[PDB]
Design an enzyme around this catalytic site. Structure first.
Site, short mmCIF file in Angstrom:
data_model
loop_
_atom_site.label_atom_id
_atom_site.label_comp_id
_atom_site.label_asym_id
_atom_site.label_seq_id
_atom_site.Cartn_x
_atom_site.Cartn_y
_atom_site.Cartn_z
NE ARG A 107 15.79 1.73 -12.53
CZ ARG A 107 16.54 2.72 -12.99
NH1 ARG A 107 17.03 3.63 -12.15
NH2 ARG A 107 16.82 2.80 -14.28
CB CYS A 148 -2.12 -2.93 5.60
SG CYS A 148 -0.63 -3.70 6.28
CE1 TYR A 202 9.41 1.82 -7.08
CE2 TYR A 202 11.53 2.93 -7.11
CZ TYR A 202 10.15 2.97 -6.98
OH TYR A 202 9.49 4.16 -6.75
NE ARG A 222 2.51 -0.36 -6.54
CZ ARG A 222 1.79 -1.21 -7.28
NH1 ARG A 222 1.03 -2.11 -6.69
NH2 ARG A 222 1.84 -1.16 -8.61
CD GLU A 265 -1.82 0.38 -5.75
OE1 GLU A 265 -2.76 1.21 -5.76
OE2 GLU A 265 -0.62 0.72 -5.74
NE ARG A 310 6.00 3.88 -3.01
CZ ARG A 310 5.61 3.42 -4.19
NH1 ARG A 310 5.14 4.25 -5.11
NH2 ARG A 310 5.71 2.12 -4.46
NE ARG A 316 6.61 -10.02 13.03
CZ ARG A 316 6.39 -11.33 13.10
NH1 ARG A 316 5.53 -11.81 14.00
NH2 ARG A 316 7.03 -12.16 12.29
#
EC number: 5.4.99.5
Lengths: 117, 117, 117
Positions: free
Chosen positions: B116, B75, B108, B90, B78, B7, B63
């Site tokens: 975090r 993608c 993070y 994220r 959220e 993550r 890329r």
């Protein structure tokens, strides 16, 4: 050995933090139970919620599970489908396991029992 | 062998293509540096953005990384949490590795440092 | 065996249940034929749709595939990006395979041909 996804789905009665965490925690616990899941064996987890829930990220519930603090998790918005189940939280838990695909125990709780195959 | 989710999360100051790409690139480069990730060992990657970002898909950053052109990435939106971190991007990078779960290095950056664990 | 992601993308002319299911089925079928995919080697599947599509969960298509009823799948909303491709469905199918990363066959159909690298 193999990697497999485990699916779960639950619903809440209201968009509050406590409801969302409670029902999420309960969902993860039932999954873990039925699939004898250990946290070291979990590759990652994705959690989704329908766009009518705003109070809290359901991932907050993962940290309430003893031993799960290193399991990587992120959330996402579920698609808003016409007539689709309201206030619904869904999981995809990816685990290493020797349990065959047709023997994995996907979990549907609360109003989400309607989405059960 | 085993695969493991990594993550990362960061933030942009403004919703511009140049900030999204720059911050996204920097997040991935940090994740890569900390975990010694080679592109061939990357199963797939997921990028999410909060619903206040619309300038570019952050996946385009991927890329700007030479050697990364065959890494599958996609993608998603959220969820919109009331009081949740704004302008936040994220990552969930799924890699092949023998590094134990409690030793994976999650990243993070920027204002997302507050995420975090 | 190594695990790998397979990306697909397609579009629909109209936001109706039958076209979404048709185009989604057609996308999966092509991915399956180019990659010689057997359902039991499929870890899990993620499908996303742009926010102009509300007619049905694309996941329902997967249920039209004989042998695929135990493949775990879930959907999400794709981020809304200025100038992003309209009415688009995207898939990430995670599979066990020995095919090298740069030999994996990702599939871009209909108006999504523009997404091809």
């Amino acid at each position: 050995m193999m990697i497999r996804g485990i699916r779960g789905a639950t619903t809440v009665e209201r968009d509050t933090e406590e409801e969302i965490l409670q029902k999420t925690k309960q969902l993860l616990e039932k999954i873990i139970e039925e699939n004898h899941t250990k946290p070291e064996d979990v590759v990652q987890m994705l959690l989704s919620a329908t766009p009518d829930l705003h109070a809290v990220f359901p991932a907050k519930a993962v940290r309430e599970l003893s031993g799960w603090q290193y399991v990587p998790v992120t959330c996402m918005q579920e698609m808003d489908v016409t007539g689709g189940l309201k206030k619904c939280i869904r999981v995809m838990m990816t685990v290493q396991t020797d349990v065959p695909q047709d023997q994995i125990r996907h979990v549907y709780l609360e109003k989400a029992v309607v989405l059960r195959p």
